[PDB]
Each structure stands twice: as C-alpha cells, then as structure tokens.
C-alpha cells in the first residue's frame, strides 16, 4: 500500500532518543507508538519532533515492528530514510546480534535499497552476549598492563618498555565506573624525613585528574592514602622510598 517514503532521520545514543521527520497523518503515528513502547521511556529521554503533513509518505510498520524489537537491545542505533533510500548505522558489539538485525532489515522492506553500516567496537567472536563490558575487566586488565604497579616479586618475567598499554587501559577504564572504583596509595612515614604522606596524597589527585580527563567518571572514584601502614620496606635508602611508592586501581 505504498511506493515512496519521506525523509526521516532517527539517531539513538546511550539513553537519548532523538526523533525528527514528518508523518503522513496521525494514524501512522499510532504505529510508531507501538515501536516506541518497546524502546523505553523511564530514565530514558524520548522526544518526537515529527511534523504532520497530508502529503508526505511513510513506510508501513506491519512487519517492521519486529525489526525494531531486535534492535531495541542495541545502543548507538540509527536509521536514515530517504524515499527509495534506506540507511541504518550503529555500533554492534556482538556480531551475532547484527546477524539477526541484518536479516530483519532485509525482511523489513525487501522492496527497497538497504545499506548496513555497522562497525564492531572490538567485539564479534561468539562470546558472552552482553556487549563485552568492564565485567571482570580487573582480571583481564592485569594482562593488558602486564607490568609492575603493586605487589610485584617476579625475578625477571618480561621487561616491556612501552606506554601504549596505558592509553589502551584508559579507554576501557572510562566505561569501568559502571561499578565502584577504589584507589589506594602505598607509602612510608617518618615526618619530614619521610614526607611521603603528603606526596602520596597529592599524587593520587594527579591520577584522578588524568583518568577523569579520559572520560573517567570521578563521581565513583575513591582515593585513600595509607602511609606508614604495610611498611613493605624500611625508609632509609632511595630503594625504600620506591619500594613503598605504590599505587593500585580496582573496579567493582
């Protein structure tokens, strides 16, 4: 019961949904409401800036509703409509999810041109379907860092002199706050001769400022400087200061 569609642009990012375009009437809007009910509404913001014009055209959502449902559990999803032109873009962690959506798009409206522009955020291999988040990342992060940072007593296992790994961890660290993060600072204490406590405290602040600059939510970041305690080594030689000078990052 159609032949052409109007220019519609819809972009979804995180928990924000921006709808802008035109509708052939109010009856068509009802169909959209059904596809929206699935989307969400609560802590999620939903705006519909669609104008009603008794001249424009729209694609029927008869067998398209099921398609939106498959893409409902996928963020960064977007859809561009332009008459005989249909382009859908978005980021899909699990390739398996895209496979199902890809078929849905083709099944949605085969009588039209469809272009799948989905990129993998680094995930695809048949793994735990859940957008490889910062889950147990703490265990995996240890591998990415594969370097000394806290409690290290390895005779001599691997001696990499790089820093690129730090930038990599920061990227993953920015989405790690999903849980709780605790930052501890190790240092000695003697008063004046040690003055390690003041430096350890201020030092932690520098770390937070850097991580936060990468997009790390400092609203869940906690720092605690425990000096004097757990006196790994004594304070007397240059090695003593470095021995106690330690830091650790833990995310729940």
UniProtKB/Swiss-Prot annotation:
Record's function text: Probably plays a role in ammonia secretion that neutralizes the medium at pH 5.5, although it does not play a direct role in ammonia transport. The OmpA-like domain (196-326) binds M.tuberculosis peptidoglycan. Overexpression in M.bovis or M.smegmatis gives channels with average conductance value of 1,600 +/- 100 pS, but this may not be physiologically relevant.
Subcellular compartments: Secreted, Cell wall; Cell outer membrane
Cofactor: Zn(2+)
Cofactor binding notes: May bind Zn(2+) via residues in the BON domain.
Listed GO MF terms: metal ion binding; peptidoglycan binding; porin activity
Span of domain OmpA-like: 138-252
Complex and partners: Controversial; may form oligomers, or not.
GO cellular component terms, semicolon-separated: cell outer membrane; cytosol; extracellular region; peptidoglycan-based cell wall; plasma membrane
Keyword list, A-Z: Cell outer membrane, Cell wall, Disulfide bond, Ion transport, Membrane, Metal-binding, Secreted, Transmembrane, Transmembrane helix, Transport, Zinc
Any one GO BP annotation for this protein: monoatomic ion transport
Induction of expression: Induced at low pH (at protein level), upon infecting a human monocytic cell line and in murine bone marrow macrophages. Part of the arfA-arfB-arfC operon. Maximal expression of ArfA requires the full operon.
Disulfide bonds: 134-176
Family note: Belongs to the outer membrane OOP (TC 1.B.6) superfamily. ArfA family.
Phenotype of null mutants: Significantly impaired growth at pH 5.5, reduced uptake of serine at both pH 7.2 and 5.5. Reduces growth in macrophages and in intravenously infected mice. But the same mutant has very little effect when studied by another group. Upon operon disruption no reduction of serine uptake at pH 6.9, no visible effect on outer membrane permeability, however severe delays in ammonia secretion, medium pH neutralization and growth also occur at pH 5.5.
Domain BON: 53-122
The name this protein goes by in its record: Peptidoglycan-binding protein ArfA
Range of the intact protein held here: 75 to 326 of 326
